[PDB]
Paper text:
Ribulose-1,5-bisphosphate carboxylase-oxygenase ([name]) is not only one such enzyme where biological function is predicated upon oligomeric state but is also capable of adopting multiple assemblies. All RuBisCOs are composed of a core dimeric scaffold with two monomers arranged in C2 symmetry, which is requisite for forming the active site and enabling catalytic activity; however, complexes from dimeric building blocks can assemble into higher-order structures. In particular, representatives of form II RuBisCOs have been shown to assemble as either dimers or hexamers, in which the hexamers are composed of base dimers arranged in D3 symmetry. Here, we investigate the diversity and evolutionary trajectory of oligomerization in form II RuBisCOs, revealing a trend of structural plasticity that underlies the interconversion between, and innovation of, multiple oligomeric states.
Previously, [name] has only been described to form dimers and assemblies composed of repeating dimers, which arrange into dihedral ring-like structures around a central solvent channel (e.g., hexamers, octamers, and decamers), with previous work suggesting the existence of a tetrameric assembly from the organism [name]. SEC-SAXS-MALS analysis on the [name] enzyme revealed a molecular weight of 218.3 kDa, in agreement with a proposed composition of four large subunits of approximately 50 kDa each. To better understand the oligomeric state of [name] [name], we solved its crystal structure at 1.7-Å resolution, clearly displaying its tetrameric assembly. Last, the dimer-tetramer clade is composed of dimers and the tetrameric [name], providing a glimpse into how nature has been able to evolve and innovate new oligomeric states. In conjunction with our phylogenetic analyses, this observation highlights the unique assembly of the tetramer, as its early divergence from the remainder of form II [name] precedes the innovation of the hexameric state yet remains maintained after the divergence from ancestral node 9 into the remainder of the dimer-tetramer clade. However, [name] dimers within an octameric core are vertically aligned in parallel, whereas the [name] [name]’s central axis results in the observed angled assembly, thus precluding the formation of form I–like octamers from form II tetrameric RuBisCOs. This further illustrates the differences between the evolutionary trajectory of form I and form II oligomeric state, as the geometric differences between a pair of form I dimers and the form II tetramer suggest the independent innovation of the tetrameric state. Ultimately, the tetrameric form of [name] exemplifies how the structural plasticity of proteins enables the innovation of entirely new oligomeric states through the recruitment of surface residues to mediate protein-protein interactions.
Residue numbers in the entry:
A (entry chain A), B (entry chain A), C (entry chain A), D (entry chain A): 2 to 53, 63 to 463
The structure:
C-alpha cells in the first residue's frame, strides 16, 4: 500500500552508488501469506526510516526479485539517505548501534514477512570516513616483534586446554611451555576473574611466564587478555590492571585485549577502542551465531558482521579456516578476510572502498597445523594472519613449543616457495609435524615416509 | 562421545534447584544428520563450559527429551556451576555479557546441530543478588507525577508521527499539543542528532514545550530522550546535555533516557545504568527480532530476553499488547509482564525469584486505544504500565490532547469497576473515543450508539 | 604603562554590578620597589585577561586604594567581562579551573608585586546560573534520618582516634560503639586503602557495624567514606565498591563520599559531583592552608575558597568553630557559613546572590562539646550543621555513645530555648557532660554543681 | 609535648635513606610565640600521620636546626613510613593527591607555627616505581619531527599575541604565518571555548593552517591545544574532538594537549594522562604561584612542584629562562630542568633516583631570542627543550617565520660549536636577529656590526 511513497523501482543502482548520498542494503525477504512482495518491501523501507520535509529522507525500495531464492524468498534492495544517520556530539561520527537500528532494527519484528536477512550493504565515502575504524592491527604486532611492517607475515598462536578451569599456576606454566617456541597466546572467551582463577592471581603469573620465556629465547611473545565486562569502568579497571602488570617487565605493548564483542555489543567494543586505542583489540565473536547463522532467516550474513566489526574498530577477528581446517569450510570464504584487510573489496552485492580505514586482521583458528598451512596460505594469497592452533601446536609429538616452531616453519616454507618435503629435511620441527599428523601427510605429501625416514 | 563426562541424566532438577549452586538453562535443539541427541547435548555442555580441578565446574546435561518438539527438535537442559561465572573487579557482580557468552555463546555456531534456542533459565539466589538490576522504574515516575508509589497506575503516552524526519520546531509543537492532555512522550528509536534536527536545536524546544504545557495545565509531563551511542563518553555527553536543558525549567527529574539496548548491547545499557542510575532507563528493543523471533531456531525466546533486560537494569521495556492491540498478540503473553515486574514469577520451565530486585516496568504499545484498555487491564490484573498510543491518541477525533485524556479516563473507568458506557456519559473524552473508533465500540460495547446519542 | 588601556578608574562599581556583565574581584596587592600601584594593577589586569576585537574583553582596573593596608599593600579591584570565561562543550557551563586560571593564575607569579591576594569576588546572575553547584546537602541527610527537610537540625558526629593506623576490626568496633548513641562518622582524610587496613577489608566491617547499630537502636546512622584518588576511574571504582557494600544492608543512601578537594583539585571534586551527584560530597580541605592561610600574601581568603567550593558542588565543607571551640576562632567567621548555606549573602566587598543554587552545609569541628554547642548555636542563628566532635564525644565520662547523645541533647535544649541546667535535670547524658568537662561548666553555667548534685 | 613519641633525633638520615622504607621531607618552619621548635615539629609529624599497631606508622621528626633560617625559622625533617601511603584499587599505585594530603595537608593550617614550607622530599625506590610518571615527552615529538630520538634537540616555538581575544580566522592565520618557519605553537592557558572564538570554529582552522604550512614547507609542525576542564567527560570530549579534526589531515600525532594542572589539580592531569597517555601532556602551571612563590612561608618550593608534576605524568612543563631571558632568573635554576629530565638528580636536601621513570621535558619561555639561546644552551649543557618565544619570534624584523628560523639556527650554531658571528655570515635569519635585537648583540657579540655590515 505504501509502495507509491517508499518504492521507486525506476532508480538505477549505479546512479545511487555514483552519487554517494545513500547507504544501500540488500536483503533476503520472504513475504507472509496474503502479502505482496513489493507491499512488504515498501513497508520495510517505511519501518526502517520515516515510518509513514519527511519525503527527502524516506528510505526507498529500488530493486526487487521476488523469486531470487525460491522457497527461501526473494531479493530486496533499499536505499537509505545518508541524512538519516546519527552524529556524535563529540566528533560527528556515526554510531554503529544507530545505523543497525535503522537498517536491521524494528524490521526484524514485522509480521508481514517470514524472514528478513541482510546479505550485504554499501557505504559511500561520506559515511565510511565518519566511522571510528581500527586504530591498531597486525602491523603493530609486527613492530613489537621486530618484523617489517609491510608483509611481516604469520604469527604462530595457540589456545590453552582445558579452555576454562585451569588454576592460575598451571595456566601460566602452559603459557611458558608454549612460548618457548610459539609467539601468541589468548585467554578463552569466558576466562577472566572466576573465583577458582582470580585475575589478580593469574595475570602476574602470565606476565612472569612471558618475561622468563623472552629471556630464555631472546624472542618477543604476545598475550591477548580478556577484559570483557558490561560496565565501562570495569573494563577500564581490567585493562589498566593488566597493562601495569606487564609493564613491570617492560612488556606493556606485548598485550592485546580480548573483547567478546557480540555479547557486549558495539558499545563494549567502543569502550576498548576509545580508551585503549593503541592496545590491539581482539574481537571474539562468541554468540554471534544467533545473528549470523545460515540456519536463521533473520539477522545478517557473516560478511556483513565482518564489515561492522571493522567499522567499530576491531584490530583482529576470527574468520575461519576456509575449508583447510576442521569447521564450516570453503576456500571461497576468503572474501571474509579480504573485506576485513584490504583497502577495497568486492562483496556479494556491493563493491566497498575503505578510503584508508585500517585493516582488521584475520585471526585463523579451527584445526590447522603446519602441513595444512601451506595450502591455506596459497589459497589466501598471503600469510599476514594470526593463527591459534589447539591441536596443531600441543598435538605435536615433541610438545607445544615444537608445535609452535613447526607453524612458523610452515610460513617460511611457503614464503620461500620451497617443496615442503625438501624443506622438512632441513627443519626438524616441520619434519616432525609429518609424524604428528601422518593422516594429513599421507594425503598432502605422498612419499614423505621414504624421503624423510 | 563426551556424554560420559558432560552428561548425568540421573541428576534430579529439583535437587539442582534446591541446592542453589547451579544456573539451569532449557534449550530446543535439533541434531544434525548422523549425530545422536545426547552426543550433541554433551558437546554443547562442553563447548559452553570447560571445553574438553576442571571436573568440578563442567556444565552437565541433566535432562533430554529428543522428541519433545517433533521436526523442530527436542528438549535439552544443562546445569552450569555458579563458579563458572565472572566477577567484576570493582563490585564482584556478574557481567551479563559474560553469562551470555557461556550459555549462548560458541554453542550458537556448532555444526552438529541444526538449531539451538534458549527457552528459559534459572538463576539461584547467589546469582540473582549479584546482578545490577534496575535502579529506577515506574514508581519513580509516580513520585514525580504526585501519585501514590504503591499502585500509582497508568501513564498515558504517545509517539510522534512521522517518527523520523520532523524538524525541531514542528516536533516540539506536536509534543506541546499532546502534553495539554497526555503525560508521556518518547523519541523514536533512531531519532537523535541528525543534521535536519540537531539535538542541541530540538531538545531546548522540547524542554520549553514541557514547561509551557505544565504551566497551562498544572500537571506534570514526562519526556523520554534518546541517548543511544556506541561510546560511553558520547552517551554521557548526551545525557548531561539533556538533563541540563530540562533543569533550566526545574524539570530534570521529568526526563527518562531511551537506550536502544539491543544494538548497543548490554555494555551500552550498563553505561546508562551506572552513570545515570536515577534517570529512568527506557530500554528500546529495536533489532532484537534477529535474536528472539520465533522464525529463528537460534537465539532465545522473548521471555529470556526480558529476564536479561531486568538484570542489566532496564527501568522499562516494551512487552506488547497481548492480543488486545494490533500486533502479534495472545492474552497469555502476560507472563512477559509478570516476569519483568513481580518479585517472583513462574516461567515456561523454571520458577524465578528476584529477591527484591526492582521491577522493570512494562511499556505497552501497538494499536491500543481507550476502549481497548479496559479488556487489556482486566486481563493483566493491574494498570501499572506506561502506554504509548499512536492512533489511540492522535486518532481521537478531537485531537491528541483529547486522545491522551481518553486514555487516562479508561484507567479511571477500570479502576472504578464502572460500566464503560455509563462512565462515558460523565466523561466526554472517553465518550468521544467511541466515535473515534466506532468499529471497536460496536464490537466491545454494542448499544453505545443509542445510550450516548 | 598599560594603565591607559587596562584601567578606567571612572567606572562606578554599582554600574558594573547592576549591569550584570562582569565578574569583579577585590585583591590586596603590594607593589615591588620602583613600581607604581596603578602601573602594577594595570599589568595584573592585562596578565589576567588579554595580555597586551580584543579591547571589548580586556579586564579593567576600576578602583584602587594604594594605602588601604599600610605596609601590607593596598586595595585593587578588577572587572572581568563575562565573555572571557570558558564554556563546556557538553553543557555550556563555566569550569571553575578556568575561572581560577584568569583571576588568580599567572598573576600569582609576577615580579612587579610582593603580594597579590584575592579578598572577595562578585559573580553576576549569568555566571552563577552557569556553574554546577551542589546536588546534595544536609537536606538529603535529613530525609534519610526521618527528619523534616526544612529545619531538620543538628547531626551529631565524631572522628575516630587514632585517625590513621587502626586495623579494620578495631576501626569498625569504634564505629559501632559510637553509633549506639551518635549519628555521623567520617574517615580521616588520608585513611583509605593502606596495606594495614585495606578498603575491601574495613568497608564490609563498617557496613556491618552500621547495620548492627541500626537494628539495636532503631535509628538511622551515616558514614562518610574517603574516595579520594587522582584518577577518575579509581574514584569511580572506590565509590561503586563502597555503595555496593552498604547496599547489601539496604543502607546505600546512608553513605556520603569524602573527597580531599584541595589536593585533588576541582577536577577531582567534579568527578564525584558528576558521577555520584546524589551521594553527599563531603569536601575535606586538607592542604588548603597553603592557599588560604593569612600568613601568605598570595592566594585567596577563606571566604573565597568557600564560594569556589559551593560552585564546584560540595555538599558540605569544614568551616570552623567560630571561637566557641579550640582553633582559630571569632564569632564573626559566621559569614563563612552564611555564604555557603544562604540564598544570598553579603561578603567583605561584594553582595552575592546564589539564584537558587543549593546550599553547601557547614561541617563544624574543633574541640566542641555539648555545653559549648548552646552558645555556638545562638551565635550562628540555627543548628542546621553536621558536627564532628573528637573529645566532645569519646571524652564523655560515660563513653562515646553517651557523648553522641549529649550532643543531640544540646540541640534539643537550644531548640526548646530551655535553661541548660534545668534541661540537664531531665536529660542524663547532657547532665553528665557537665562532669565530663567541668572546666567549661564552671565557666558557662556557674552553680551547676549544686543544682545537679 | 608529643616529642617523646613523634621525634627520634638519634635516627641517622643515611640509615633512613639506605633502608628504603621511608619518604623523607625537609621543611622550613617558624614556631609561633611561646612554642618550642621540637614541640611544634613533633606536632607536625603527628598531624601529618597518625594524629596522636599505630606506633609502627608514626611519622618521625629525625632532624631539626632551629636557627637555620634566622628570622624565617629553622629546618625540620620528618620521616614518613611508606605504609602510610595509599594504593589504588585498580593498579596499586600511589595517588599524588593522597601523598600531598599527608606531607603538606592539615599541617598547613596549624596555629602553633607562623610558616611551614616544603623544601625537598625523598622518595625511595618502592614509592617511585609506584607512581604513574610520564608516558610521553620530547622524544615522541622528535619521532614525529623525523629527528633522532636520542638527542633530537631544540624545538622552536611561539605564543600568539594577543594571547586571548583573537577571533578564529585571525588566530589560524597567525599560526600559519609562524609555521612557515617555526615548529611549535600553543594555546594560551585560558584560551579554549569562549563565545568569541568557539573551539569548534577555531580548531578546524588551525588544523587547516597546519596542513597548508606542512604542504608548503615539507616540514612537520606541532600544536598544543588546551583541553582544560573540571569534568573528566568534558576533557575527554575536547581531546577526542581535537584529535579527530587533526586526523582529517593525517596530523593526529602532531597534537599535544595543554592542561592547566594547578587549577585542575592532580586529578585533571591524571584524566589526560590515563585517557590520552600517548598525547603529549603539556602541563601549564598557571596559578601555581599561590603555592610556590617565595613570598609565601607556606606551600612548597618550585623544585618540589616539579617533582610532583613528573610523578603525575607531565610530558613537559615550564621551567624558566634561568637568568638568560626576562623573568626571575639565575643560571642555578638549571636544577629544576635536571630534576625533570634526568634519571637521577641531586636536590637541595635529597638525592633522587627515578628508576627509569620517563623525563618531563623543560618548556622554556621568558623573553628568549636566537642570540641569547647560545649562552642558555651552554649553561644547561644541552638543547633538548621546547621553547616558546613571543618577541624572539614575532619581534624578528623579517617576521615570525624568520624569527622561528633564527631560533633553529641558534641551535645549529651551538650544536656545531661555531662562532656565532662567523655562523651568521652563512645563515641570514640568525644574522638578522642581530639587527632585530641589537641591544643584545652589542652586549653578547661586540664587533658584529662591522663583521656583518
Amino acid at each position: 500500500d505504501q509502495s507509491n511513497r517508499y518504492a521507486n523501482l525506476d532508480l538505477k543502482e549505479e546512479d545511487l552508488i555514483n552519487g554517494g548520498r545513500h547507504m544501500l542494503v540488500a536483503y533476503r525477504m520472504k513475504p507472509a501469506p496474503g502479502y505482496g512482495f513489493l507491499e512488504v518491501a515498501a513497508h520495510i523501507a517505511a519501518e526502517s526510516s520515516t515510518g509513514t520535509f519527511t519525503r527527502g529522507v524516506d528510505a526507498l525500495v529500488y530493486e526487487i526479485d521476488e523469486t531470487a531464492f525460491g522457497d527461501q524468498g526473494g531479493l530486496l534492495k533499499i536505499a537509505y539517505p545518508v541524512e538519516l544517520f546519527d552524529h556524535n556530539l563529540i566528533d560527528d561520527k556515526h554510531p554503529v548501534s544507530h545505523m543497525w537500528s535503522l537498517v536491521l532494527g524494528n524490521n526484524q519484528g514485522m509480521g508481514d514477512h517470514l524472514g528478513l536477512r541482510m546479505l550485504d550493504f554499501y557505504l559511500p565515502e561520506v559515511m565510511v570516513r565518519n566511522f571510528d575504524g581500527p586504530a591498531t592491527n597486525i602491523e603493530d604486532m609486527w613492530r613489537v616483534l621486530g618484523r617489517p611492517t609491510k608483509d611481516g607475515g604469520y604469527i604462530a598462536g595457540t589456545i590453552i586446554k582445558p579452555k576454562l578451569g585451569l588454576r592460575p599456576e598451571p595456566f601460566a606454566k602452559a603459557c611458558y611451555d608454549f612460548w618457548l617456541g610459539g609467539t601468541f597466546i589468548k585467554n578463552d572467551e569466558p576466562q577472566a576473574n572466576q573465583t577458582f582463577a582470580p585475575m589478580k592471581k593469574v595475570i602476574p603469573l602470565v606476565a612472569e611466564a612471558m618475561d622468563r620465556a623472552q629471556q630464555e629465547t631472546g624472542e618477543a611473545k604476545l598475550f591477548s587478555a580478556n577484559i570483557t565486562a558490561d560496565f565501562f569502568g570495569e573494563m577500564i579497571a581490567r585493562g589498566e590492571y593488566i597493562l601495569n602488570e606487564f609493564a613491570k617487565y617492560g612488556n606493556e605493548d606485548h598485550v592485546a585485549f580480548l573483547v567478546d564483542g557480540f555479547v557486549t555489543g558495539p558499545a563494549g567494543v567502543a569502550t576498548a577502542r576509545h580508551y585503549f586505542p593503541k592496545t590491539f583489540l581482539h574481537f571474539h565473536r562468541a554468540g554471534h551465531g544467533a545473528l549470523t547463522s545460515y540456519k536463521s532467516p533473520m539477522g545478517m550474513d557473516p560478511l556483513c558482521y565482518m564489515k561492522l566489526a571493522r567499522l567499530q574498530g576491531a584490530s583482529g577477528i576470527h574468520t575461519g579456516t576456509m575449508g583447510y581446517g576442521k569447521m564450516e569450510g570453503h576456500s571461497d570464504e576468503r572474501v571474509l578476510a579480504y573485506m576485513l584487510e584490504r583497502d577495497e573489496c568486492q562483496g556479494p552485492y556491493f563493491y566497498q572502498k575503505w578510503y584508508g580505514m585500517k585493516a582488521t586482521t584475520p585471526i585463523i583458528s579451527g584445526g590447522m597445523n603446519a602441513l595444512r598451512l601451506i595450502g591455506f596460505f596459497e589459497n589466501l594469497g598471503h600469510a599476514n594472519v594470526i593463527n591459534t592452533c589447539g591441536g596443531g601446536s600441543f598435538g605435536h609429538i615433541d610438545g607445544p613449543a615444537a608445535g609452535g616452531k613447526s607453524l612458523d616453519q610452515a610460513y617460511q616454507c611457503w614464503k620461500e616457495g620451497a617443496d615442503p618435503i625438501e624443506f622438512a629435511k632441513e627443519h626438524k620441527e616441520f619434519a616432525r609435524a609429518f609424524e604428528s599428523f601422518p593422516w594429513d601427510a599421507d594425503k598432502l605429501f605422498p612419499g614423505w615416509r621414504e624421503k624423510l625416514g
